Design a protein around this ligand. Structure first.
Ligand SMILES: Nc1ncnc2c1ncn2[C@@H]1O[C@H](COP(=O)(O)OP(=O)(O)NP(=O)(O)O)[C@@H](O)[C@H]1O
Ligand SMILES: [Mg+2]
Lengths: 486, 458, 458
C-alpha cells in the first residue's frame, strides 16, 4: 500500500519504511504539512530529505506519498510576489495564480531543438552592453569577490527590463533575509517589481530548501520560454547553493572529491544552466499545441559566483565558467578605486558576442573594446610628465577618459538612446578634445539632456539599432550642436 | 522514563518507548552522582533510540540508567532580572548565588528567522563613538566584526559601546563568553563592576573549560535573552566573546556525532550553523538586536571557512590598530581598514558619505607623503599637499575621544557626540576652517566647539 | 522478465532470478511515468540481482515494476546512412528526420584493434594555427589533445582546428560532443548545414544537460561509428568534446556502483575506463583515424588525475594556460608545457626542429629571468639578457593570431598561417632581423609581413 512511517530522522535526512509504490524524486507528504523528496529507494527503507523544518518530526509519524514528483506552481500570476523555495508559500498576500504546475527537475530542450541567439538583453550598464553583450537565451556569469557589485549589477539588469517584454526572476539562495527584503523594497521603489517574480530561500532555511530553490525558480521562468515568450532569471550565488548541496551530500555519506564537493557538483549546475536557452519556432509550436503558431521563446540566465580572494581557479567557479557561454569578472581593486561597474575587460567575455548586440551597438562598440584592454597595457605611465606623447600621450589620455565614461552609478540604466554618449562622443574624437576628467563624466549627463529635447526622433533608433548609412551623419550633427550648450 | 544504552564521551545514547520518542532538540535529564546531567537530543537514531550530547561531563554515567524526557527544548531565564548576573549555558546562576529570580523562561533553540516581522528601515545605530559613527557606522540590527586582540582597549570599547546604548539609548546589552579563557572572564567581570556598567549587561559564559555541548549552545542561550529584550520593544547589543570559538565548537560536536569532514576539515553543517545564529540577530518591526562579535582569522587566512563564512554575514568591521594606539589616539580604531557597508551606499545620506570618503582620502594622502617627507624635505611638498598633511594631522587627533568607562582609569569626563556634530566637526575641519587652531586642540574631546574652547584654554 | 529492487540516482538494480541473469554489458527496458527507459547492466551482483545505469532520467521509477531483458548490448547504427544528421547515445535520431539509417549495426562496447593490426604514418597535416604547427605537429592517424581550464578558449580552439582540417579532409568526419553546452552543438549543426558540409560529417550528442548514463556511454557510441567507417573507408576524422565529461560521468556513478573511492574521490578504475575508450581510437591496417579532442583540466590542476593519466594516450599534447590568456594571447597555448611526440628532427626536418627548440629555449630562459626582473627591475640584466627578454616577448606575442571562428565576439578578422611562414617568421625574429619593430607589431597578426605593416600604423 501507499503509506509509511518515519524510522529515523537526523540533520534534515529521513528514513521512511514502507511506501511500496513510491518512486524516485517523488514528493512525499508529511504532517504539517511539509514534504520530503525520495532520493533513495533502498531494499526496505526509503531515504528522503525534508523540504523545511525537521525539528519536530519523530518516529512512527504517518507518511502518505503523493501522486507526482517535485513540481510547483508555475504560470504568469507569480510576478510581483516573493515566493518561498518550494513554491506557493506567499509573502505577503494570501493567494497566487497557477497556470498549472511544472517539474522543478527537467531535461533541457534538445540539440536539434534550438535557435541561434540573435536577440539582445540590455543591462542598462554601458560598460557591459558594449564589450560583453548579453543575448536572449544566453548564460552570462557574474563572478567576483564579496562586495564588488555582483548583486547590484544583477538587479539593475532586471530593473532595466521593466518594459522590454522580458519577464524577470530573482532567486535568493542562502541570502540574509534583511538583504532580500531590501532588494524587493528597492525592486518596487525603482519600478517595477511587477515584471519580476522573486523566489527566496533565506540563509536560515533548510539546506535542501536552498539547493532546490534555483530549480524551482527556473521552472517558473521555463513556463515563458516554452510559451514563445522571452524571460530573464538570475540565480543569486550558485556558490551558496553548491555549499548547501555539499551539506546534504556529506550527510548522506556520499564520498567527497575536490574541495570536499561531491563528484556530481558539475551536473548540479550543468543541468540547471542548460535549462536557460533559446527555443526555435517548431518547439514552441509543439509545446503550445498550435496556439502560438510561430514564435521563439527564451530563458536568458546570468548566475552569480562568489570567489575567495580572486581565486578564479577554484573548483566551483571553474565549473560554472565551463558551463556558461561567457562571464563578467568584477575586479575587487577596480571596485575599490571608484570604477564601480568593476567589469574587468580583457578577461571578461561574451562568446555569443556580435549577434547579441543591436546594429548601432556592434558598429560602435567595436572601437570601445580595443582601447580599454589596451589602455591598461601601458598602465605604466600613470599619466605623467609625458613621453612619446603624440602616440603614448594621446592613446592614454583618451583611454583614461573612456574608462571614466564606462563608469556608472546604479539604478541609472542608459537606454540604447543615451548610447549616443558611448558610440560617438568617446571612441572617435569628440569628448577627448574639450572635457577634462571630471567634466568628462558630467558633460555626458547634460548631453543626454540636450537630446531629450532636440532628439525625440532618436527615440526611433533605439527602436531599431539601424545606424542606416545616413543616420551615421545625422547623429554627427546633434553632437556638434551640444558644443553650444552645457 | 528511559534507559541509557551507550555512552561514548559526551555522546550518551538513550532509548525510549517507541510510542513517545523525544523530539530532536529537546532536553533530557539523567541523575548521576550529586548533580543532574541535562542532555540535548541530536538525532532520532533508528530503533526507537535517541542520540544526545552531555551538557556536562559524561564521566560516572553507568550504562543502564533512568532519564526523564521533558518538553523543554532546554530553556533559559530571560528578562530584566538576568542583567548584572552571570549564567552558564543552562541558565544557571554561575556567579556566586543571587538565585536569579526570573519572571519567564524561553527556549534557546527558537527560530528567529522571520519575514515581514523584519522592518524596512535600514536605520543606523548611533554609537556616540566619533571614529565609528563616521568611518565605520553601525546598522540597527546589523552584525559587526571586532578585530583587535590584547593591548588595544578592546574591553573598554565594549564597555563604552555597552553603556552608550544603555544611556543615550533605551535598551541594554547581552555579553556571551564563548570559548575563551576563564581568567579573562573574571577580570572582565570586575572591569565592568568598576566601570559601573555591569548593571546593564546580561552575561553568559561557556569558557574553554566546559564540554563541547556547552560551547556550541552557549551562544544561543545568550542570543535568546537578547531576543527577549527585542520583542520587549528595545534595541539591544549582543556581544559574542568569540564567534570563531562558536563555529569551532560546532566542529567538535559534528565530529562526535560522527558526521563526515568537509572542506579543510570543517563540518558540512557550518554553512547552516552560521546562518541561524546570525539570521536571528536582526531588526524586527517590534525591536532590534545589533551584535558586535570578536573575530579570529586562523593563520591570518580570511579565506578559511570559519572567517569566509562569518564574513558573508558581517555588515561592518572595527579594526583596533596597535600603532594607532602607540601615538595616543584612543578609540584605537584605524580609520582605514575599518569598513562598513552601511556608509558605502546612499543610505546614511550623501553628506555623511562624502565627509566619510573625504576623510578616507586626506587621511590616506597623508601616509604617502609620510615617507616622501622622512626621506626628503617637507618643504618641497607643494602648497595644497602640506596643507593636506596639515589638515590630516588634525583630523586624526580629532577622531580620538575620551570614554565614560575610562573616567575611573583617567579622570577625564569624556562624552558622547551625535552623528551630526561629528559630520559638522569633520567636514568643517577638512574643507577650509579651524586651520587656525593648534593640532593639540583636537585631542581627546567631544564636538568641534569643545575643541575650539580647548584652543583658548591653551 | 524481472523487477526493480532498488533505485539510487542513475543506479538501479534489478532482480531477474537465475534462468536469465543478464550478461554483464547488456541492455534492458522499463516503463516509467510514460515512456521507454533503457538500463545498462553494469555488475552481476550476487543472488540473481543486477546493477544497471539509467540511460535517462531515473526520476519516476517505482520500486517493483517489471523490466524486459533483451540480448542486444546497445543498438547504434553505422555506415553512410548515419552521415546525414545527429544521433543519441542510444543511436536514436535526435534531429527531426526519422532516420533511414542502418544497413547494419554495432555494439557501443568493442575491443581495441590487434597489436599487429595497428598501423602508423608520418604524413604531417597542416593546421592553420601558428602555435600548433610549429610547437606540436601530427601526421594523419594521430591523437591530438587540447588541455585547458574553464574559459581558456577550449571550444573555439577545437572549432578552428575543425574548420582548418575538415577542408583538406575530402573524407568522412565524425564529431561527437559529450558533456558540452547544447548551444554550441545547435550552432555547429546549423553552421555546417549552410556550408553544406554535413553530408560528409556525422553527429552524435550527449549533452552536459543529460543524465549521467548518457554521458559515459555517448563517447562510445561516438567512435563506434568512426570505427565502422574505418574498417572500410580509410581516412576518418574524429572530434570529441571533453573526454573528461565521460570520466566525470563515471565518477558520479562510482559511488553508487559501490566501489571504494580512489585518489581525490575518483574511481579506482580511472586507469582502465580511460584506456579502454582511448585505446579504441587508432590507425588500423584497414584505415586510419585522425582525431583531436578537448580534455578538460579541473580547477587548473594539471596534476589532477583526469589530465595526468590522459596525457600518455596522446600523440600531440597542446595545453592552454590561464596565465597566457590573462595577457591577451588567445591561442592561449603554453609553448613550454605543450609538446608532441613527433617534434622529431628526422620527421619534421631540421629547420622546423631547430626553430621549434630555439623558440622553446629563449622562451624558457626568459621564464628564469622573470624573477629577478620583478624584484630588481630590467636595468639589472646584462645587455645580452636584456636582449633575450626583448626577443622573447616578440615571440611570446607572435604566437598569437585571430581565429575566423572567433570573429563573432571580437572585432579582429581571422587569419591562416602557412606552416612554411610560421618557420620563416620565428626563425627570423630569433636571428635578430625584426628587432627594431616594437612588440605590438607582432601581437595578433598572420605572417611576419603583417607584423611589418602593423608596425607602420603603430
Ligand atoms: N554601479 C555601482 N555604483 C555605485 N555603487 C555601487 C555600484 N555597484 C555596487 N555598488 C556598491 O557596492 C556595495 C555592495 O554591492 P553588492 O551588490 O552588495 O556587491 P555583492 O558582490 O553582491 N556583495 P555581497 O552581497 O557581499 O556578495 C553597495 O554598497 C553599493 O553601493
Ligand atoms: Mg550580494
Amino acid at each position: 500500500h501507499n503509506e509509511g512511517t518515519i524510522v529515523s530522522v537526523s540533520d534534515g535526512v529521513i528514513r521512511i519504511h514502507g511506501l511500496a509504490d513510491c518512486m524516485q524524486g517523488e514528493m512525499i507528504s508529511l504532517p504539517g504539512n511539509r514534504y520530503a523528496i525520495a532520493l533513495n529507494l533502498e531494499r526496505d527503507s526509503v531515504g528522503a530529505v525534508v523540504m523545511g523544518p525537521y525539528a519536530d518530526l519523530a518516529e512512527g509519524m504517518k507518511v502518505k506519498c503523493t501522486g507526482r514528483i517535485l513540481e510547483v506552481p508555475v504560470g504568469r500570476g507569480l510576478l510581483g510576489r516573493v515566493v518561498n523555495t518550494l513554491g506557493a508559500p506567499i509573502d505577503g498576500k494570501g493567494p497566487l495564480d497557477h497556470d498549472g504546475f511544472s517539474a522543478v527537475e527537467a531535461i533541457a530542450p534538445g540539440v536539434i531543438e534550438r535557435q541561434s541567439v540573435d536577440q539582445p538583453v540590455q543591462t542598462g550598464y554601458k560598460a557591459v552592453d558594449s564589450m560583453i553583450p548579453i543575448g536572449r537565451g544566453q548564460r552570462e556569469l557574474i563572478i567576483g569577490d564579496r562586495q564588488t557589485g555582483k548583486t547590484a549589477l544583477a538587479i539593475d539588469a532586471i530593473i532595466n527590463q521593466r518594459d522590454s517584454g522580458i519577464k524577470c526572476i530573482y532567486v535568493a539562495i542562502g541570502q540574509k533575509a534583511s538583504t532580500i527584503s531590501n532588494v524587493v523594497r528597492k525592486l518596487e521603489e525603482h519600478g517595477a517589481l511587477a515584471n519580476t517574480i522573486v523566489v527566496v530561500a533565506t540563509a536560515s532555511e533548510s539546506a535542501a530548501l536552498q539547493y532546490l530553490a534555483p530549480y524551482a525558480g527556473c521552472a517558473m521562468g521555463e513556463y515563458f520560454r516554452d510559451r514563445g515568450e522571452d524571460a530573464l532569471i538570475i540565480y543569486d550565488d550558485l556558490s551558496k547553493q553548491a555549499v548547501a548541496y555539499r551539506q546534504i551530500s556529506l550527510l548522506l555519506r556520499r564520498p567527497p572529491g575536490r574541495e570536499a564537493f561531491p563528484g556530481d557538483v558539475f551536473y548540479l549546475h550543468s543541468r540547471l544552466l542548460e535549462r536557460a536557452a533559446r527555443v526555435n519556432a517548431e518547439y514552441v509550436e509543439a509545446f503550445t499545441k498550435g496556439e502560438v503558431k510561430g514564435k521563439t521563446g527564451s530563458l536568458t540566465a546570468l548566475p552569480i559566483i562568489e570567489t575567495q580572494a580572486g581565486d578564479v581557479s577554484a573548483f566551483v567557479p571553474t565549473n560554472v565558467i565551463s558551463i556558461t557561454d561567457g562571464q563578467i569578472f568584477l575586479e575587487t581593486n577596480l571596485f575599490n578605486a571608484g570604477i564601480r561597474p568593476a567589469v574587468n575587460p580583457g578577461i571578461s567575455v561574451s562568446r555569443v558576442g556580435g549577434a547579441a548586440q543591436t546594429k548601432i551597438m556592434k558598429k560602435l562598440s567595436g572601437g570601445i573594446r580595443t582601447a580599454l584592454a589596451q589602455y591598461r597595457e601601458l598602465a605604466a605611465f600613470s599619466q605623467f610628465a609625458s613621453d612619446l606623447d603624440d602616440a603614448t600621450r594621446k592613446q592614454l589620455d583618451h583611454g583614461q577618459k573612456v574608462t571614466e565614461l564606462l563608469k556608472q552609478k546604479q539604478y541609472a540604466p542608459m537606454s540604447v538612446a543615451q548610447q549616443s554618449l558611448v558610440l560617438f562622443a568617446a571612441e572617435r574624437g569628440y569628448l577627448a578634445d574639450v572635457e577634462l576628467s571630471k567634466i568628462g563624466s558630467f558633460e555626458a549627463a547634460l548631453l543626454a539632456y540636450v537630446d531629450r529635447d532636440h532628439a525625440p526622433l532618436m527615440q526611433e533608433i533605439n527602436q531599431t539599432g539601424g545606424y542606416n548609412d545616413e543616420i551615421e551623419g545625422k547623429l554627427k550633427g546633434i553632437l556638434d550642436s551640444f558644443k553650444a550648450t552645457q | 522514563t528511559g534507559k541509557i544504552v551507550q555512552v561514548i564521551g559526551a555522546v550518551v545514547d538513550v532509548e525510549f518507548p517507541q510510542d513517545a520518542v523525544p523530539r530532536v532538540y529537546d532536553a533530557l535529564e539523567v541523575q548521576n552522582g550529586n548533580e543532574r546531567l541535562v542532555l540535548e537530543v541530536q538525532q532520532q537514531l533508528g530503533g526507537g533510540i535517541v542520540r544526545t550530547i552531555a551538557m556536562g561531563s559524561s564521566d560516572g554515567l553507568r550504562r543502564g540508567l533512568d532519564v526523564k524526557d521533558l518538553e523543554h527544548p532546554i530553556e533559559v531565564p530571560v528578562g530584566e532580572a538576568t542583567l548584572g548576573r552571570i549564567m552558564n549555558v543552562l541558565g544557571e546562576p554561575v556567579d556566586m548565588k543571587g538565585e536569579i529570580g526570573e519572571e519567564e523562561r524561553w527556549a534557546i533553540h527558537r527560530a528567529a528567522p522571520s519575514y515581514e516581522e523584519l522592518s524596512n528601515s535600514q536605520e543606523l545605530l548611533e554609537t556616540g563613538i566619533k571614529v565609528i559613527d563616521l568611518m565605520c557606522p553601525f546598522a540597527k540590527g546589523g552584525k559587526v566584526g571586532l578585530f583587535g586582540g590584547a593591548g588595544v582597549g578592546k574591553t573598554v570599547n565594549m564597555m563604552e559601546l555597552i553603556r552608550n546604548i544603555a544611556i543615550e539609548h533605551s535598551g541594554y546589552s547581552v555579553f556571551a563568553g564563548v570559548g575563551e579563557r576563564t581568567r579573562e572572564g573574571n577580570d572582565f567581570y570586575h572591569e565592568m563592576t568598576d566601570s559601573n556598567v555591569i548593571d546593564k549587561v546580561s552575561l553568559v559564559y561557556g569558557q574553554m573549560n566546559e564540554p563541547p555541548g556547552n560551547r556550541l549552545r552557549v551562544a544561543l542561550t545568550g542570543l535568546t535573552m537578547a531576543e527577549k529584550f527585542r520583542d520587549e520593544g528595545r534595541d539591544v547589543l549582543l556581544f559574542v566573546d568569540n564567534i570563531y570559538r562558536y563555529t569551532l565548537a560546532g566542529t567538535e560536536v559534528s565530529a562526535l556525532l560522527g558526521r563526515m569532514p568537509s572542506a579543510v576539515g570543517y563540518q558540512p553543517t557550518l554553512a547552516e550553523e552560521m546562518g541561524v545564529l546570525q539570521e536571528r540577530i536582526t531588526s524586527t518591526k517590534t525591536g532590534s538586536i545589533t551584535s558586535v562579535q570578536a573575530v579570529y582569522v586562523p593563520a591570518d587566512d580570511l579565506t578559511d571557512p570559519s572567517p569566509a563564512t562569518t564574513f558573508a554575514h558581517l555588515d561592518a568591521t572595527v579594526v583596533l590598530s596597535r600603532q594607532i594606539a602607540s601615538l595616543g589616539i584612543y578609540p584605537a580604531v584605524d580609520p582605514l581598514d575599518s569598513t562598513s557597508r552601511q556608509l558605502d551606499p546612499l543610505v546614511v545620506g550623501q553628506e555623511h558619505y562624502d565627509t566619510a570618503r573625504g576623510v578616507q582620502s586626506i587621511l590616506q594622502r597623508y601616509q604617502e607623503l609620510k615617507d616622501i617627507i622622512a626621506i626628503l624635505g617637507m618643504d618641497e611638498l607643494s602648497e595644497e599637499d602640506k596643507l593636506v598633511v596639515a589638515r590630516a594631522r588634525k583630523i586624526q587627533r580629532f577622531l580620538s575621544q575620551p570614554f565614560f568607562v575610562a573616567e575611573v582609569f583617567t579622570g577625564s569626563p569624556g562624552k558622547y557626540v551625535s552623528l551630526k556634530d561629528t559630520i559638522r566637526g569633520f567636514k568643517g575641519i577638512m574643507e577650509g576652517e579651524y586651520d587656525h587652531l593648534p593640532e593639540q586642540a583636537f585631542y581627546m574631546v567631544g564636538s568641534i566647539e569643545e575643541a575650539v574652547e580647548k584652543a583658548k584654554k591653551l
